Amino acid sequence: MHHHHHHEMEKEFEQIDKSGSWAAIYQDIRHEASDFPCRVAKLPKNKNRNRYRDVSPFDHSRIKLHQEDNDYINASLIKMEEAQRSYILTQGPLPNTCGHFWEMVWEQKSRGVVMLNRVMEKGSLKCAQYWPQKEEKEMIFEDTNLKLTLISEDIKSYYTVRQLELENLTTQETREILHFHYTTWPDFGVPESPASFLNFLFKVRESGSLSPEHGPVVVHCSAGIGRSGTFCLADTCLLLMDKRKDPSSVDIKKVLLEMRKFRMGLIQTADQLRFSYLAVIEGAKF
Ligand SMILES: NC(=O)[C@H](Cc1ccc(C(F)(F)P(=O)(O)O)cc1)NC(=O)[C@H](Cc1ccccc1)NC(=O)Cc1ccc(C(F)(F)P(=O)(O)O)cc1
Ligand SMILES: CCCCCCCCO[C@@H]1O[C@H](CO)[C@@H](O)[C@H](O)[C@H]1O
C-alpha cells in the first residue's frame, strides 16, 4: 500500500461525501440484498429465543447449539472466504438465552466476545447482563452447566475490556474469554469517532481473538445487524486491503452484499455505511 492507494481511497471518500451519495449506495445494497429461508427461527417453539420478530438468522448459516433439546439460537456464521475470517453475529442475549449464548461460545471455541450496544437503550432492556460484576463475580448458568467468573475489568472512556474465565462444570476445563465492550455506540448511530472505533478494533485484533487459531469471535449489539454489521464490514475490508496486491480494488458494496448472504440487514443506516468506509481508509494508514 503506497501513497497513491491512500490518495485514491481518500479522494473517493471525499467525492462520495461532498456529493452526499451514501443514501443512494445504501439503498442499492438494501434493494439488492439476498433473502433466504429462516424456517427454524420462525418455529413457535423458538418464539421466546428471538428478541425481534423481524430479525432472524437464515437457516443455511445459523449456528446450531450442540445440545439435543433445542439447538436454536439467533446467531449466524459469517464466513468471508477471501479475507480468511469467520465471525459469529448474534442478538443481545435475552434473560432466558444467556446460557445458550455461553454454550455457543464454548462450543465454537471462541476466545473473544465483542459487545457494541448497552444493556438499556431507549428505556428498555436490549441485552441481558450475561456477565458478572464486582459484587458477584461468579455466575452459573441454568441448564447449560457452565460457570463464568469476572477476572478483571478495565473501564475506559469509550469501551471496557474484561478478562473472564469460562468453566465447563462437567469437565472442569476452564478457558479465558476476553470481553470487549464498546460502550458509546448508540442504536442506529455511529461510534464516538473513527479513532476510538479503530483503537477498539485494534485492541480486539491484538488480543488474538480474531485469529484462525481460535474459534470465530462472537459479535453482538441488540439485534446483531446494524452495529455488528458495521464492525465486521470494516474489519473485513481492512483485511482485504492488507491481503490484495491492489488495496484500492476493495469494493465496499460488494463485500457488504456478500456478508449479507449470511445474515440479514448488516449495517442499518447510510451513516453507518459511511462510517465503515471512513474507518477503513483511516485504518489503512496503520
Ligand atoms: N426494526 C427495529 O428497529 C427492530 C429490530 C432492530 C433493533 C435494533 C437494530 C440495530 F440496528 F439498532 P443493532 O445495531 O442492535 O442491529 C436493528 C434492528 N424491530 C422491532 O422494533 C420490532 C417491531 C418492528 C418490526 C419491523 C419494523 C419496525 C419495528 N419489535 C419486535 O419485533 C418485538 C416483538 C413485538 C411483538 C411480538 C409479537 F406480537 F409477535 P408477540 O405476539 O410475541 O407479543 C414479537 C416481537
Ligand atoms: C471500504 C474502502 C473502499 C476503498 C475504495 C477505494 C476505491 C478507489 O477507486 C478509485 O478512486 C479514485 C478517486 O475518486 C478514482 O479517480 C478512480 O477512478 C477509482 O478507481
Side-chain angles (χ1 to χ4, degrees):
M1 173 127 203
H2 50 236
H3 285 80
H4 183 57
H5 284 140
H6 288 294
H7 179 99
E8 297 301 83
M9 267 170 223
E10 283 160 41
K11 173 173 161 187
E12 182 69 7
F13 180 86
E14 280 161 35
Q15 294 290 275
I16 297 171
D17 215 28
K18 66 160 286 191
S19 64
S21 300
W22 302 109
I25 308 308
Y26 186 53
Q27 164 67 205
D28 296 350
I29 288 159
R30 291 184 60 256
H31 200 252
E32 300 166 26
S34 58
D35 191 35
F36 299 102
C38 298
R39 294 193 179 89
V40 180
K42 287 300 168 177
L43 294 170
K45 77 181 199 277
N46 288 147
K47 193 183 68 178
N48 54 38
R49 293 188 182 200
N50 296 307
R51 178 174 293 286
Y52 302 108
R53 65 178 187 285
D54 60 314
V55 181
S56 305
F58 297 131
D59 294 323
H60 76 81
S61 63
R62 79 183 178 94
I63 295 293
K64 294 185 185 179
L65 301 169
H66 296 183
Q67 58 161 272
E68 59 318 282
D69 185 61
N70 181 345
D71 70 16
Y72 179 78
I73 182 171
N74 191 312
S76 305
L77 176 62
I78 279 55
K79 190 178 175 183
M80 304 303 284
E81 303 295 316
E82 189 183 352
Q84 281 165 180
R85 184 156 288 171
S86 284
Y87 310 90
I88 283 173
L89 275 67
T90 186
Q91 64 181 17
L94 293 158
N96 63 308
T97 69
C98 287
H100 304 150
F101 177 86
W102 288 114
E103 177 185 350
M104 171 173 74
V105 161
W106 183 273
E107 297 168 351
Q108 305 302 135
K109 288 170 154 50
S110 311
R111 171 175 170 62
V113 170
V114 164
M115 171 169 192
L116 313 168
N117 65 314
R118 297 118 103 195
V119 172
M120 180 174 273
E121 301 185 328
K122 303 294 174 45
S124 66
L125 192 65
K126 293 302 157 63
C127 181
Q129 187 172 349
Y130 58 87
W131 70 90
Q133 42 191 283
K134 47 207 172 175
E135 278 177 46
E136 39 198 307
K137 273 177 172 287
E138 160 175 332
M139 284 170 86
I140 298 171
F141 293 97
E142 19 76 274
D143 295 304
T144 221
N145 275 297
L146 294 163
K147 178 168 82 166
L148 180 73
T149 304
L150 173 67
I151 299 307
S152 76
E153 169 173 88
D154 180 18
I155 298 176
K156 291 181 174 303
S157 175
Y158 306 121
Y159 62 93
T160 291
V161 180
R162 304 174 174 100
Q163 304 184 64
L164 304 163
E165 180 174 299
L166 185 59
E167 187 187 334
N168 173 319
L169 296 179
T170 300
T171 68
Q172 300 190 316
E173 176 183 356
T174 67
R175 300 189 186 161
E176 177 188 35
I177 298 304
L178 297 178
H179 192 248
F180 298 95
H181 186 184
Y182 192 94
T183 57
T184 180
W185 198 338
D187 56 303
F188 295 103
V190 291
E192 130 82 8
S193 68
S196 69
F197 170 84
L198 289 172
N199 186 54
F200 182 73
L201 177 58
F202 288 140
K203 205 63 64 176
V204 175
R205 282 182 169 204
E206 291 167 10
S207 77
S209 304
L210 296 172
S211 175
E213 304 162 311
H214 293 301
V217 61
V218 168
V219 184
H220 83 82
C221 36
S222 181
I225 63 176
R227 289 166 283 182
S228 293
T230 305
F231 177 81
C232 293
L233 179 62
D235 179 58
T236 289
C237 288
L238 283 166
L239 244 29
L240 290 172
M241 301 209 129
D242 193 37
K243 181 174 175 175
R244 293 188 177 176
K245 310 286 232 318
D246 178 13
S248 75
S249 69
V250 178
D251 184 336
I252 194 182
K253 169 169 174 298
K254 183 177 195 183
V255 178
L256 180 56
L257 282 167
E258 169 72 21
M259 297 194 126
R260 284 194 171 211
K261 290 183 196 170
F262 302 98
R263 187 174 175 81
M264 68 179 57
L266 303 189
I267 300 212
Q268 283 286 304
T269 72
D271 246 303
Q272 288 180 342
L273 175 62
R274 166 188 189 281
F275 184 86
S276 290
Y277 201 122
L278 181 52
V280 171
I281 66 180
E282 223 67 297
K285 301 178 178 181
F286 303 74

